Design a protein around this nucleic acid. Structure first.
Ligand code: SF4
Ligand SMILES: [Zn+2]
Lengths: 75, 85, 319, 77, 303
DNA sequence: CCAGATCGTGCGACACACCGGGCCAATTGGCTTGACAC
DNA sequence: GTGTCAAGCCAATTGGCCCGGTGTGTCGCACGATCTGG
């Protein structure tokens, strides 16, 4: 369009159009919904890179949970 | 060293937006964040006092703060607050 | 080059015979290139018919008054001048008015010969008092624009002839103006407003069409110098531009009998254009033919009005 | 059309002078603006507009139109 | 059935600007589309409701500043729907950009706009009002009911679920054969939600209906609620018999032997199952024959 | 003509559709306990 | 007394992932009726 400017990859996150509470389950909640949503987001690689760089162990980023991020970070 | 009206109105809008965003969270999470950063009274509090009021461990209180802090810094609730930073 | 914004013409009706046309949005300038041209062509380039001279009676040039009639010579001439007539004879044609007695002599009392007509019989031409008589003759002929009695004075002298000004042009008054109209794009795009007022005979729209045709001919006269010369291309002609939505569509049909669609699909027809034209012979000769199938490819084929054996646009398939 | 609508002569037939008309129209405009601002929240005494409006019309113009049409009355307190 | 509830919802007066913007965005996101033409964009919205088309038209014009068309060509294309298609041509690109459908200088947006999400709870109520107006169905799989709205994608379904959560309600996304929807199975939750949207008369009618009907003890469990469901499919066959009496009002158009016999067996044995009815034929015909015969009887009596 | 498209008819296949009933898994959320830095 | 990290365990979720009745409807197709048309 005529915006001619991009703030970054945040503006192009699919999860913005979806329940923000579904990415932080609670009391035995599931993860299939958010993980399925992430697999269509275009900036998934950028989201995962940002999550790894900031090394936060809460919520799910890039389509992976906290445990998956820990396992990936082990190497 | 005067009050620029644009900056004052911007700060007031930021305060309103922060209160609105913190409302979407649960009561416990919003309360712990408010009493940790002292939004209501401007008096920062230690983790142990927060646990005392909540009757939980200090480390457990530290756990809650991190969860909410990451929740706000997510690519689903950040864009409502990105501009003000 | 491409104009990139095709101007449009819109009419408004003020009275029975008064209109106001708006052309917009014209490129910067171009509100004066074709404003004075339209006004002058309207006012001086449309054929008409009018009275040229009159013969009130055997006695005249007593300008003080014509005996028997209340008014004077000048008022009578003006009333005659207001008359609107239509004629077909190239040569002048003479008609007579023979009202008698007291009363109000009007246009309906005239006795035009064949080939001429008077469009406002209700016009009042004079008033007769004291059992007066008014035996008048009117000569009518065709012309263009406004030509005065000067250029109509006759060297040959006749006792009763009196030449009068002739108003041939159907349009009586034309005015125009231009304004700025663009906000979205850059300003300085011209909007042209022309107010036209004619007489009872002709409507403003016909006058506008005739003037446009005459100007188109006049400027084609110069465009003929080198036909392969680039100009400003309007581009999307409205007629075919609109009809492209249904005439040259690749899809042969959307809703119709499946039997006929299947039969005609694998027989040498893909886009409705290939079928609209040369339909009868193609449907007859080849194995694919139907008696009542015509009803499905003749009447229901006209999505928005169409008959077969019609010339199809876009004969080149955009493969 | 624009800032010359409605005409001042027609408006002055509904009041005593320009000075009173100014305050009359200003008070009505403030009422309309307050009604718009608090329309979503709990109901309040404010009412109007009483005439057809546009997408984003100045409340003062609506107040002047209402005054001209004769849908308002001014008392003395 | 639903039409009355949708009418009550639409006739309701809405005041807060944010709610109106959210409702317009939701309706445009569910039952509307973009039709690229001449390198520009035009917006169409097909609604299967009486006046919600006027509501969307007025809201667009007032809060966004645009002029609509409201062509009443039926949406189904067969002219039977008699439902309204509102179009925006001039400036529709700006409406698309500032309603949330398309933003970020890129493709359209799959789910609900980011602005409707993350807003006051009233904003979520408006989002549900719009979504339930676009599509919807108030089904009764038995005596207790279940709402339904066929969202145009999993992202929209999940967004609606999340918006429901903020209203204290319980919602469940679901998908079948590639088309997905949102279902709230619990009847009490159904009433709770339908109260928020604005409808009350419809809420009262639904509450009285379900309350009176549901209180039919059948020991639950299998073969005790399952027999209750055979009887409920028999009540569905009673509705089919009502369709057969509609066919009788039409006279059935001098039907042949097979369909007449099938209808007679269904009516006389109003509780007998399709298999049981088929077992009653002189030449024993299977459940398939009765199924096809009722299918074709309904097709014939459609008029 | 009479033969395929469309549909009547009919038989079956099969995907649910319950409607509940239950064993186990993910993961994981919450809480604590200890340990290490002030 | 505070502010981090680093494990560790139990528990109610959802959820996977099934058993077990019929039952129903969408398709998936054979025969055949009827119709419209090569
Ligand atoms: S990958 Fe990141 S940005 Fe994309 S939907 Fe998932 S959490 Fe949002
Ligand atoms: Zn709201």
């Amino acid at each position: 369009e005529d915006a001619d400017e991009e703030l970054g990859w945040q503006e192009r996150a699919l999860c913005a159009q979806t329940d923000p509470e579904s990415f932080f389950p609670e009391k035995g909640g599931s993860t299939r919904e958010a993980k399925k949503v992430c697999l269509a987001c275009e900036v998934r690689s950028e989201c995962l890179e940002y999550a790894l760089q900031n090394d936060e162990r809460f919520g799910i980023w890039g389509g992976l949970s906290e445990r998956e991020r820990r396992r990936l970070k082990k190497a | 060293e005067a009050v620029v009206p644009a900056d004052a109105v911007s700060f007031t809008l930021l305060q309103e937006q922060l209160h609105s965003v913190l409302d979407t969270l649960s009561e416990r999470e919003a309360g712990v964040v408010s009493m940790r950063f002292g939004l209501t009274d401007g008096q920062p509090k230690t983790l142990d006092e927060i646990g005392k009021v909540y009757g939980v461990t200090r480390e457990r209180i530290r756990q809650i703060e991190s969860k909410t802090m990451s929740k706000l810094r997510h690519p689903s609730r950040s864009q409502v607050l990105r501009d003000y930073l | 080059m491409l104009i990139a914004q095709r101007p449009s013409l819109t009419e408004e009706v003020v009275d029975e015979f008064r209109s106001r046309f708006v052309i917009e949005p014209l490129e910067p300038g171009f509100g004066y290139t074709l404003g004075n041209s339209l006004r002058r062509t309207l006012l001086s380039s449309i054929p008409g018919a009018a009275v040229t001279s009159i013969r009130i009676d055997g006695v005249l040039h007593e300008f003080t008054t014509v005996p028997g009639v209340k008014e004077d010579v000048t008022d009578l001439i003006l009333n005659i001048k207001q008359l609107v007539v239509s004629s077909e004879h190239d040569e002048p044609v003479v008609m007579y008015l023979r009202k008698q007695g007291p009363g109000l002599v009007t246009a309906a009392d005239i006795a035009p010969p064949a080939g001429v007509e008077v469009h406002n019989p209700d016009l009042v031409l004079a008033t007769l008092n004291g059992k007066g008589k008014l035996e008048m003759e009117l000569t009518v002929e065709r012309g263009r624009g406004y030509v005065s009695a000067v250029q109509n004075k006759q060297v040959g002298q006749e006792i009763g002839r009196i030449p009068v000004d002739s108003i041939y042009s159907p349009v009586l008054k034309v005015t125009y103006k231009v304004e700025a109209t663009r906000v979205e794009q850059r300003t300085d795009f011209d909007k042209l407003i022309v107010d036209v007022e004619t007489k009872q005979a002709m409507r403003p729209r016909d006058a506008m069409a005739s003037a446009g045709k005459t100007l188109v001919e006049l400027f084609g006269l110069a465009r003929e110098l080198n036909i392969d010369a680039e100009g400003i291309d309007m581009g999307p002609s409205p007629t075919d531009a609109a009809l492209a939505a249904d005439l040259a569509l690749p899809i042969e049909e959307l809703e119709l009998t499946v039997r006929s669609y299947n039969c005609l699909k694998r027989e040498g027809i893909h886009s409705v254009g290939e079928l609209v034209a040369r339909s009868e012979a193609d449907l007859l000769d080849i194995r694919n033919f139907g008696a009542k199938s015509i009803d499905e490819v003749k009447a229901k084929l006209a999505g928005m009005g169409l008959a077969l054996k019609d010339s199809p646009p876009g004969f080149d398939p955009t493969a | 059309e624009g800032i010359i609508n409605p005409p001042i002569d027609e408006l002055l037939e509904a009041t005593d002078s320009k000075y009173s008309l100014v305050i009359y129209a200003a008070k009505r405009a403030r009422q309309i603006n307050a009604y718009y601002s608090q329309l979503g929240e709990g109901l309040l005494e404010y009412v109007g507009p009483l005439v057809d409006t546009h997408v984003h019309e100045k409340p003062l113009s609506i107040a002047l139109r209402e005054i001209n049409a004769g849908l308002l009355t001014s008392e003395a307190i | 059935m639903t039409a009355a509830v949708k009418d009550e919802i639409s006739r309701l007066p809405v005041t807060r600007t944010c709610c109106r913007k959210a409702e317009v965005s939701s309706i445009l996101r569910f039952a509307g589309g973009l039709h690229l033409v001449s390198g520009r964009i035009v917006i169409e919205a097909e609604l299967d409701t009486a006046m919600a088309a006027r509501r969307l038209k007025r809201d667009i014009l007032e809060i966004f500043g645009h002029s609509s068309e409201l062509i009443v060509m039926a949406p189904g294309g067969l002219r039977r729907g008699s439902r309204f298609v509102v179009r925006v041509v001039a400036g529709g690109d700006q409406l698309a950009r500032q309603t949330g459908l398309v933003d970020g200088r890129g493709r359209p947006i799959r789910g609900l706009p980011p602005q409707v999400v993350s807003g006051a709870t009233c904003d979520a109520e408006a989002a549900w009002r719009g979504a339930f107006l676009a599509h919807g169905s108030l089904t009764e799989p038995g005596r207790s009911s279940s709402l339904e709205v066929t969202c145009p994608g999993p992202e929209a379904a999940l967004a609606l679920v999340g918006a429901a959560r903020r209203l204290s309600i319980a919602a469940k996304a679901r998908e079948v054969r590639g088309v997905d929807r949102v279902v709230v199975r619990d009847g009490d939750a159904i009433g709770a939600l339908l109260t928020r949207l604005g409808a009350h008369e419809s809420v009262l009618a639904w509450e009285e209906r379900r309350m009176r009907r549901e209180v039919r003890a059948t020991a639950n469990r299998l073969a005790n609620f399952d027999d209750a469901n055979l009887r409920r499919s028999a009540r569905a066959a009673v509705a089919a018999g009502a369709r057969v009496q509609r066919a009788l009002e039409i006279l059935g158009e001098e039907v042949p032997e097979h369909l007449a016999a099938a209808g007679r067996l269904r009516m006389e044995h109003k509780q007998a199952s399709l298999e049981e009815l088929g077992a009653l034929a002189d030449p024993p015909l299977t459940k398939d024959a009765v199924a096809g015969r009722i299918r074709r009887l309904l097709a014939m009596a459609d008029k």
